[PDB]
């Protein structure tokens, strides 16, 4: 009945949209970004691992089944 | 200082694979590329230099308990042959890959065939265990 | 002659091959430790043999 047709790669404009907005969510999971922007959870994990590489997000708990990252502590 | 029990094992295998590559004197088998980790396994190991990862684990089991032959390492290293529709059973590892991991570590002086059988960990092996233990300990510290 | 015919079928394995020395039956042969008996004779002879209802 319902299906998820998610995009494999970000466009450049979407890259600007990520650089702007994604660090503003308090929950940053690859699944969170996947549901909002209709993108795959695995590349989502790689994207959040990328905000880690560029140095944009702090990890709360990553684990083989389920990972969780966030924008670093707000205060 | 530190030992395998002191270490978190996941980054242990990655540090030791790098450590054994740095040594670059295991004499890795020719078929490492072709082989699959068990007739009951579907894909090849996730680590690209996986033969090094199991050489680590098998050696470290011989530290944990020496005298661990091939069949011994396969029993400890056994698991679910998830048979789908049929019921599940215990499944040994693959021989060729296990026997060659043990023969690889017998080659480069990590493991040693003790008198009266079985392997004991050699002076070089216990050295390498506590050095990479300190290295990984420094990483997690 | 008859000596090459009488019993010429091969009896090498299975509950069909061996059989109970009581029944000559091929049903439930206790083969462990060489008891070699059917579930019915076993149930019949368990007390004599020494088996016992502990639990």
């Amino acid at each position: 009945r319902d299906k998820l047709n998610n995009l494999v790669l970000f466009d450049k404009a979407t890259y600007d949209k990520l650089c702007k907005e994604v660090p503003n969510y308090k929950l940053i999971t690859p699944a969170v970004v996947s549901e909002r922007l209709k993108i795959r959870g695995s590349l989502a994990r790689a994207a959040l691992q990328e905000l880690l590489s560029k140095g944009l997000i702090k990890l709360v708990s990553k684990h083989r089944a389920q990972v969780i990252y966030t924008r670093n502590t707000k205060g | 200082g530190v030992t395998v029990k002191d270490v978190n094992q996941q980054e242990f295998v990655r540090a030791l694979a790098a450590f054994l590559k740095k040594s670059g004197k295991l004499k890795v088998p020719e078929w490492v590329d072709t082989v699959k980790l068990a007739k009951h396994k579907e894909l090849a190991p996730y680590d690209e230099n996986w033969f090094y990862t199991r050489a680590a684990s098998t050696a470290r089991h011989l530290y944990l308990r020496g005298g661990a032959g091939v069949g011994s390492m396969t029993k400890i290293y056994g698991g679910r042959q998830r048979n789908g529709v049929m019921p599940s059973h215990f499944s040994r590892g693959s021989k060729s890959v296990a026997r060659r991991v043990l023969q690889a570590l017998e080659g480069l002086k990590m493991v040693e065939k003790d008198q009266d059988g079985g392997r004991k960990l050699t002076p070089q092996g216990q050295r390498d265990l506590d050095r990479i233990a300190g290295q990984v300990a420094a990483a997690k510290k | 002659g008859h000596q090459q015919l009488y019993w010429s079928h091969p009896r090498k394995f299975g509950q069909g091959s061996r059989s109970c020395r009581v029944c000559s039956n091929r049903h439930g042969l206790i083969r462990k430790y060489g008891l070699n008996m059917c579930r019915q004779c076993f149930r019949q002879y368990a007390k004599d043999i020494g088996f016992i209802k502990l639990d």
Partner: protein
């Protein structure tokens, strides 16, 4: 039942030397177990013994898979009459 005359006389002698006899009821036997020095397949002993029984010479009992025959004095005396032996010698069960 095809005996060799050798068996007829040696089997009667066997019945004499041990007054009593036991045998497994088992048709599918290459060799007899208790008496394995001679081949005398159990089917041979079985069919001879059932022929003796038919003519009154052995007492019958059947257990598990195994006939049990008691030889009577008529059997003792008939065996010594066939083999023409003296009355002095005896089976081991008669001898003391």
């Amino acid at each position: 039942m095809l005996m060799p005359k050798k068996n007829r006389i040696a089997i009667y002698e066997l019945l004499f030397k041990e007054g009593v006899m036991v045998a497994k009821k088992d048709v599918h036997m290459p060799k007899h177990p208790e008496l394995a020095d001679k081949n005398v397949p159990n089917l041979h002993v079985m069919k001879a013994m059932q022929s003796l029984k038919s003519r009154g010479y052995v007492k019958e009992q059947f257990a598990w898979r195994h006939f049990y025959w008691y030889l009577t004095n008529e059997g003792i005396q008939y065996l010594r009459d066939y083999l023409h032996l003296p009355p002095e010698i005896v089976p081991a069960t008669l001898r003391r």
